């Protein structure tokens, strides 16, 4: 049932700004959306780095309770490992966490949902959608 | 309003009083488990509750601080 | 998880699927209606209540007498 | 998820004196707090040892109904075993029940909430907080 | 299927001395034997307190892999809490861990297997067997 | 001797070469999972392997050091 | 867990019940016979072998180039 | 059960130089050692980045086949999130991948085995060991 993998950027964008456009897409694609543990730690970091952690955590908890958090498996690691190497030979710069999110999607064959496509665009074998 | 929890079909179920009765059009709903709180929402309006309330504080880092 | 809504005891009621099933200790529940969404919270969780309710007696052993 | 494991010490302190400071900490971190089954038996012992058992028992019951009681698992036992040995080698004395509570927390990576920080500080690999 | 709860004493007695009598009873009552997590941490402590931990742990692992380790639940805690109180009113001294093992058995209705009956004999509602 | 792992009845099973074939009298056996090692023992002789080998070192505290 | 012994490929063989089932990666296995007990250990686990087997090449990046 | 989570640093060190000291530590604590999926992708990256990928990949495969690869779960992510925030507040710098490995260990209560003790010592609630 899972088709889309929500990245960190599109997530934080949604939690902070709560855009209406994203609400409809979320309500429509409910059940086919998931995030990576990599994405999770990042949103946890944001909440824990704030002066009102508990408040922000709860907001996050509501978000997470409606989707599935997939665990970074050996498959994700393998794919990302390859990916990292490929980008190196090509000299394309992608951030670490983002590299892992991309690998996680490839391992499970999911669609990356982002607001910054240009970032994931360098990696090959990836279908990306901009829900911004 | 308060209510009772009963068992039906070998699982938990909750009676909702007429004071808190959902619109008749709503046949399919979606339950979300946030801690001990269950959020029943009409199917297709699952994110409405989260988007409406649940305001995040202003200090919430809008960037990402990803090393790079 | 998504369940189905049913009618029982002359009231609209909903099942709690295995995933979102409440702690079995929770027998009484308060229902809050926010728009089309229903908030099901265990009746009796506010710490403020217990912090303001009945207190223990003077006999309550302060030290634990932890063997040692 | 759960973040804090309340010690027996911090529990008895709150049940008897119901301090305002702790209420705020409780109300703030509600849902992220738990006790060990070791703690449960101890406060049960206290109530059954009291002159109005059922009275204090009822209070005890209300308290536990609001937090989560985690079961002392094999993971907790193993960590406690390590802790016990470590403390012995160093000649650092920690009470039996406290040793077990510490293991339960460490095995799960929880922050110990207690008012006796010095006793639990002897244990290594454990994060401690005083909510008194 | 579980009928017997092996205490710490009868366990250490078996692991250290490997008595023949216990082997037959074990081979015969295989499947109806279990230990408490309390017992586990104690045998872990012994191995970790030794100069050859890894070696001793492995011996223990073989032992544990053939029985079931039951987790100290709230039921065990409740029973032990009562038990502790009872002994206090009676002025009967029983060691802490032993108090918990006894409660764990009562909670699940198991037979305490020991070499020192006199210890558990003070607690009421307990059926004990000496497999020494 | 080395052998192969195959699947039968939707679970794992292991062929044992005739070089390591168990006594014909032994029909019921007992498998024990110690880490990655599986110990197959004739039922009723489960503890024989552990009691025979698996010697514990001398420093192994024969008392209990229970606070009291 | 106790399983049952069967005969296949003209050899005595045993099933690994769900509880004691091996890691699925383990396809080759060595069987050691100690008396009436059989020791099933994954073929190829001795660290001494890998520590004495083939090594990597000089190209193997020592530093991790951890972004930062 | 598992006790040690091997860091990427300690892994690459062993794979390249195959040190005798570490063999003894490995042979001694065999079965109680694991790596994180984060570590896996990193050494996979290294092999795929090398001039004889399949060659080093084969070596890498042998190594992982002998330990356990734990999946970066939501528990690990949460702890890493906390760690990330904590380190920031204190101005202590730890690398991204290392932050995640530390969280994975803390969430499970494992001892970090690394050769770069100073980097991981900055993280709190974590037990570290140098097996080099």
PDB file of N, CA, C and O in Angstrom, chain E residues 32 37 43 47 52 88 93-94 96 101 103 112 116:
ATOM      1  N   UNK E  32       8.630 -28.015  32.018  1.00  0.00           N
ATOM      2  CA  UNK E  32       7.827 -27.528  33.127  1.00  0.00           C
ATOM      3  C   UNK E  32       8.643 -26.684  34.098  1.00  0.00           C
ATOM      4  O   UNK E  32       8.219 -26.482  35.238  1.00  0.00           O
ATOM      5  N   UNK E  37      13.305 -13.334  36.240  1.00  0.00           N
ATOM      6  CA  UNK E  37      14.322 -12.355  35.869  1.00  0.00           C
ATOM      7  C   UNK E  37      15.198 -12.007  37.060  1.00  0.00           C
ATOM      8  O   UNK E  37      16.398 -11.747  36.902  1.00  0.00           O
ATOM      9  N   UNK E  43      22.462 -14.594  38.467  1.00  0.00           N
ATOM     10  CA  UNK E  43      23.449 -15.471  37.846  1.00  0.00           C
ATOM     11  C   UNK E  43      24.318 -14.677  36.883  1.00  0.00           C
ATOM     12  O   UNK E  43      25.497 -14.996  36.694  1.00  0.00           O
ATOM     13  N   UNK E  47      28.580 -14.342  36.970  1.00  0.00           N
ATOM     14  CA  UNK E  47      29.456 -14.456  35.808  1.00  0.00           C
ATOM     15  C   UNK E  47      30.254 -13.175  35.592  1.00  0.00           C
ATOM     16  O   UNK E  47      31.467 -13.217  35.351  1.00  0.00           O
ATOM     17  N   UNK E  52      36.674 -14.695  34.462  1.00  0.00           N
ATOM     18  CA  UNK E  52      36.390 -15.223  33.129  1.00  0.00           C
ATOM     19  C   UNK E  52      34.897 -15.088  32.834  1.00  0.00           C
ATOM     20  O   UNK E  52      34.157 -16.079  32.827  1.00  0.00           O
ATOM     21  N   UNK E  88       6.665  -8.788  57.573  1.00  0.00           N
ATOM     22  CA  UNK E  88       6.945  -7.721  58.528  1.00  0.00           C
ATOM     23  C   UNK E  88       6.084  -7.866  59.776  1.00  0.00           C
ATOM     24  O   UNK E  88       6.602  -7.892  60.899  1.00  0.00           O
ATOM     25  N   UNK E  93      12.340 -12.815  58.664  1.00  0.00           N
ATOM     26  CA  UNK E  93      13.301 -12.206  57.734  1.00  0.00           C
ATOM     27  C   UNK E  93      13.538 -13.044  56.489  1.00  0.00           C
ATOM     28  O   UNK E  93      13.989 -14.189  56.579  1.00  0.00           O
ATOM     29  N   UNK E  94      13.258 -12.477  55.322  1.00  0.00           N
ATOM     30  CA  UNK E  94      13.552 -13.113  54.047  1.00  0.00           C
ATOM     31  C   UNK E  94      14.286 -12.100  53.185  1.00  0.00           C
ATOM     32  O   UNK E  94      13.959 -10.908  53.201  1.00  0.00           O
ATOM     33  N   UNK E  96      15.680  -9.898  50.032  1.00  0.00           N
ATOM     34  CA  UNK E  96      14.891  -9.156  49.034  1.00  0.00           C
ATOM     35  C   UNK E  96      14.594  -9.943  47.768  1.00  0.00           C
ATOM     36  O   UNK E  96      13.428 -10.157  47.425  1.00  0.00           O
ATOM     37  N   UNK E 101      11.249 -13.547  44.176  1.00  0.00           N
ATOM     38  CA  UNK E 101      11.062 -14.864  43.562  1.00  0.00           C
ATOM     39  C   UNK E 101       9.810 -15.538  44.106  1.00  0.00           C
ATOM     40  O   UNK E 101       9.028 -16.127  43.351  1.00  0.00           O
ATOM     41  N   UNK E 103       7.092 -14.103  45.411  1.00  0.00           N
ATOM     42  CA  UNK E 103       5.934 -13.432  44.842  1.00  0.00           C
ATOM     43  C   UNK E 103       5.682 -13.826  43.401  1.00  0.00           C
ATOM     44  O   UNK E 103       4.538 -14.071  43.000  1.00  0.00           O
ATOM     45  N   UNK E 112       8.092 -23.627  43.961  1.00  0.00           N
ATOM     46  CA  UNK E 112       9.456 -23.174  44.211  1.00  0.00           C
ATOM     47  C   UNK E 112      10.338 -24.405  44.382  1.00  0.00           C
ATOM     48  O   UNK E 112      10.039 -25.293  45.190  1.00  0.00           O
ATOM     49  N   UNK E 116      17.527 -24.743  49.845  1.00  0.00           N
ATOM     50  CA  UNK E 116      17.280 -24.155  51.162  1.00  0.00           C
ATOM     51  C   UNK E 116      15.786 -23.865  51.293  1.00  0.00           C
ATOM     52  O   UNK E 116      15.324 -22.772  50.963  1.00  0.00           O
TER      53      UNK E 116
END
